[PDB]
Amino acid sequence: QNLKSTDRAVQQMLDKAKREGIQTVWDRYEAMKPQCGFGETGLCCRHCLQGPCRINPFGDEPKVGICGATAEVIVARGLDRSIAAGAAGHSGHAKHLAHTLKKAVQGKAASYMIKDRTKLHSIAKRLGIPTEGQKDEDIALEVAKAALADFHEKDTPVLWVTTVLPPSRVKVLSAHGLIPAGIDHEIAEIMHRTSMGCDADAQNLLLGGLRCSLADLAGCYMGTDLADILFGTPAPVVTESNLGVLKADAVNVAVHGHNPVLSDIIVSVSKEMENEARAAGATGINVVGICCTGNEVLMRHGIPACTHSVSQEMAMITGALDAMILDYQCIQPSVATIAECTGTTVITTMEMSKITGATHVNFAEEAAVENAKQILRLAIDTFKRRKGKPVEIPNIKTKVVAGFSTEAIINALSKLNANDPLKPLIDNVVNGNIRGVCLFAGCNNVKVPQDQNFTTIARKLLKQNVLVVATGCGAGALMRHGFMDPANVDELCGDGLKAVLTAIGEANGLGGPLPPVLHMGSCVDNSRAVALVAALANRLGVDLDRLPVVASAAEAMHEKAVAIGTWAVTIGLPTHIGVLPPITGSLPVTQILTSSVKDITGGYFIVELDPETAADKLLAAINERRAGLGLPW
Amino acid sequence: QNLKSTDRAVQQMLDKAKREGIQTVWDRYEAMKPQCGFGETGLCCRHCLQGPCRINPFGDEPKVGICGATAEVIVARGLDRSIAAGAAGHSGHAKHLAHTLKKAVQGKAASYMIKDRTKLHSIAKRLGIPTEGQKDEDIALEVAKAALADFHEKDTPVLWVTTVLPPSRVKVLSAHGLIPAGIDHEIAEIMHRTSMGCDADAQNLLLGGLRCSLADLAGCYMGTDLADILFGTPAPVVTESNLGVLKADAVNVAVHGHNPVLSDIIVSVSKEMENEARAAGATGINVVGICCTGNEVLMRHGIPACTHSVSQEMAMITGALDAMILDYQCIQPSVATIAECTGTTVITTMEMSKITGATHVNFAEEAAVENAKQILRLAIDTFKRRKGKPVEIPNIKTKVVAGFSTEAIINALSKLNANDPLKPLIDNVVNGNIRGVCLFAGCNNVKVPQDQNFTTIARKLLKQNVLVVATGCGAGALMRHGFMDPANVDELCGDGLKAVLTAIGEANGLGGPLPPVLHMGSCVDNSRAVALVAALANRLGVDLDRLPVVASAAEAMHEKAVAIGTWAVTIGLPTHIGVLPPITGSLPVTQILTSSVKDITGGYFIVELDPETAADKLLAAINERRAGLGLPW
Ligand code: SF4
Ligand code: SF4
Ligand code: FES
Ligand code: FES
Ligand SMILES: [Fe+3]
Ligand SMILES: [Fe+3]
Ligand SMILES: [Fe+3]
Ligand SMILES: [Fe+3]
Ligand SMILES: [Fe+3]
Ligand SMILES: [Fe+3]
Ligand SMILES: [Fe+3]
Ligand SMILES: [Fe+3]
Ligand SMILES: [Fe+3]
Ligand SMILES: [Fe+3]
Ligand SMILES: [Fe+3]
Ligand SMILES: [Fe+3]
């Protein structure tokens, strides 16, 4: 089972699923092998009904699609569509929050409000929205309107790109025509240009993809901005992670998906129904997190994270998961069938994301509190049904310090230098105590033993004094293996990094250091890392492609991860991906994405499936940036 | 070669390509066989990097995608993405025209203007835009603004849906949640909901697809509206079609693609450079059409159609095609490589549609006349280079009467009844002289001998007194086989249909009848057939799903055709498709699309690859509608 997951709780539940005959994601993967080599390399096209077309990676015919589409075109078109689909997910999440904020301040949804007035005003300032002499509800209405306007063409480009990157970066991107005109506009243009008989030049196609990836970044940054206004900007918080945060004697309710518009309300409402649960025989309602919706409520409320990504079914296998509350994205639809065997009540809540066999609750912000109590009652009902059943909850959990929004990191740093808070970080980059910064992002992937790349790479970078930040299921992997527990700093961190985390932790009234890895939040909160890096760039007066900052989508899976990886490259970062994206069937495309793009944006992909090699390549990229700045390394 | 194309000109050029060693679309098809059965049935998914996932149509594992996605989900998700891609193409075309109109009336592009003032005012009226006391430029500015606003969410739904269908149809669609909120909004929502771990209920997915197909219809109808304002509403015109419209002693220039924003200007400008060509040794500039951009200038200017769809490469094989001027959609990228062997200058003009090896001219409406003269000079240059080369132009062409916009059909009918022009048509439906109406739409497809389904089906329907209208490459097929020549009415048409076409033709000062098939224009001009059918519905006081009207995408290929077929079903029509869409891998999805959808929209797909059987099924559908109206049949 350690070939399937490096997480010991997951291994224990894999043994249980096996003896109970419950099929898992790993079983369905084994049943899918050998996978199709045309698809894996990108050399398959189904964009018209003359297809499917395939191209032999090597050998004889077929060498070209039926319409004349070359390997280069087919691979670039497929990649572009994955970027657009990712942009559609992150920006659909952000669009939903924009409508939620508008509803809140127009009086149409009392469960929602402006919780972070400071963030609201700073966003308005960044966008050029006048605040002086405005009431907060009118400022927020203007902010929501601007958010919705970035989805279509207008007299300005997408402001959630142009106002969040350094002007010098915006200038480089505009010179290449890469600034998106509108988020949904770019998504539609990708779908058009990649349809049959349209764009058929790999470089032209890929430039479109980079522009669409910046539409994805805009949606991520919008999502983070709006969720912080509505639900509060995260600050440092202490909690726990892994299956051992389930409790047999409580009603265990997982919030799973990406958009916390409802799961933030579920958190609040569950706290008040602690007595309706006590009357059903439970100690209380135990809300736990899965995937990014879990990250959102972990970052803001300290809700413990139960599990992530590829292992999400295992939470159910314990027998203790009374309800799983779903919004959208990264939910294995197998959960609706596994629930028949584990007793979990699986509940969908979003109109465009239903699963056959799952109960559906038509959530509306106008009715959020009522929907939440309806769902929590089903959970309580489900707890009642398992009175006297034995559960197998692995008694395995880690301590997690998290909540490191960019505002929180700057505040923590300000305790070492109140009026120039980035300077202590830059000072230690310069003197070598911090070699560089690496962002771990993305998903787990059944092809990679769960968490093996994240932890292998993180370990090598940390010993080399790299400051590691993480989001999404990269943060989930690292938290479940103890990388967010400050007690592990001595074991994990080089002496220079230890000294810096210790200095900052002690200065913030903490028993000791910051944790080994800084959890910056959900997948849309990759935007927070952009905020941090853009702020460092502006403090140093250089562009992002001169900073010793890298990114690693160490076990990527979702179209969203392809979009993120692509905008990481577009804003100027060396960007590792530890699973094969479907590009190797075209050497020209691969050479653009791993080399020539350097000359356009300064970033570039590092495709490397061996995690020790990937760490060495990420270190070399960091050290090359250091040398470009004239710094020792 | 008759196994490849039923067009004798195409056969002759296929012989030439063979002896010259030029690879064609049919050669690349033969090299692709046997095609992948997972893809053909829809049982393949590459929506995340755990894939590719396939599902065996029958047998043992794999039975389910790695994430748990069932055959039903995978097939519905793939279909939805094809609908969204089609919507992206038609609506990108319309969006471009909207920006063109706005530029024209804001003084920023003198080559463009309001040519059809009557159409402008009627559109404004339909949309609720006040005209009384407005100048035309301000009305048109408002119309263009409304067009652009339909691409995003706003306080109204998409008006180019809700103002173009009968209120009773709009009510049925709203009751099922099928009215699109915004064109690019729906495209993005499809891409989101079909991404990994989101929507996983076949019925929910397919309802999303029907809504997105109405976003496609809106883009088609917008495109037709705006092109008519800018370039004129078509009226009956006489011209010719097939390769014999090439002339060895002229500069032959093909306009190819879909959006005529530039090719309409090329038509005008070529007429004035007739003397610059004469000085290079040519008789003049001979502009000819390929595919839908060709249909646009055929409908408006009588430009002869050279060829269509699957056989587009054959125009080049003659050796006489000096230039091929490309915008986007349905262009085989092989043309850029075949040009090296035929001497044709292939020119791209749209920034998001380039082809490696083709010359690119950065067309801007602000510079249209200058771009056109630049391109026509390259063509003249190319004619000079083939002084004294022999060409092989098959001496094969047909006579084509076309230009049957809905306005033109109503006007033609008005000569039989001035104040109730639809009544003569309805009278003859009721008395059986017209059994029903069939719209032929869509592409050719290399899998089907070129034109065989269009002509086989058309022949049977016409002998049974069906009024046949056609668009796009369905119109192209029928024109090249003589179905738009009124001299063939006696051979092709039943006595009742003949009597009606004769009555109308004679009443419109014509030597004789209307042609056997009414050419209603390009692919976006499928919207014209909707206008006609909606007008008939409103005159009778019934909804479209009670009218004896059917549609046939007899040889479909492009994602656009899937979108059209789907909105034909959604607005209430029995809709034949003569190639297999990728749905047969899921019986539940197939049963929804061919049966249960009847109960939602009244329309339904008829999947039938044998054209004689398909004609029988279309006749049965027409006759069932007749019986529902209480009419003989
Ligand atoms: S778009 Fe071209 S390569 Fe793709 S399926 Fe169609 S014919 Fe094949
Ligand atoms: S979305 Fe599901 S079915 Fe599709 S490739 Fe990924 S794991 Fe396979
Ligand atoms: S041939 Fe397998 S992915 Fe298409
Ligand atoms: S397995 Fe062939 S289309 Fe994917
Ligand atoms: Fe995740
Ligand atoms: Fe996530
Ligand atoms: Fe993620
Ligand atoms: Fe992910
Ligand atoms: Fe994910
Ligand atoms: Fe993610
Ligand atoms: Fe066509
Ligand atoms: Fe067409
Ligand atoms: Fe067509
Ligand atoms: Fe077509
Ligand atoms: Fe076409
Ligand atoms: Fe078409």
From Swiss-Prot, chains A, B:
User: Which Enzyme Commission number(s) are listed?
Assistant: 1.2.7.4
Q: Where does [4Fe-4S] cluster 1 bind?
A: C36, C44
Record's Gene Ontology CC terms? cytoplasm; plasma membrane
What does the UniProt cofactor note say? Binds 3 [4Fe-4S] clusters per homodimer.
> What controls how active this protein is?
Inactivated by O(2).
Gene Ontology MF term list: 4 iron, 4 sulfur cluster binding; anaerobic carbon-monoxide dehydrogenase activity; hydroxylamine reductase activity; nickel cation binding; peroxidase activity
| Lipid bilayer topology | Peripheral membrane protein
Tagged with keyword Metal-binding? yes
Disulfide bond sites: none
| First-level EC class | oxidoreductase
Show the CDD domains listed in the entry. CODH
The record, for InterPro entries, names: CO_DH_a-bundle (IPR016101), CODH (IPR010047), HCP/CODH (IPR004137), Prismane-like_a/b-sand (IPR016099), Prismane-like_sf (IPR011254)
Q: What is known of its domains?
A: Cluster B is an all-cysteinyl-liganded 4Fe-4S cluster; cluster C is a mixed Ni-Fe-S cluster which is the active site of CO oxidation. Cluster D is also an all-cysteinyl-liganded 4Fe-4S cluster that bridges the two subunits of the CODH dimer.
| Name used for this protein in its record | Carbon monoxide dehydrogenase 2
Give the source species. Answer: Carboxydothermus hydrogenoformans (strain ATCC BAA-161 / DSM 6008 / Z-2901)
Q: What is the lineage of its organism?
A: Bacteria, Bacillati, Bacillota, Clostridia, Thermoanaerobacterales
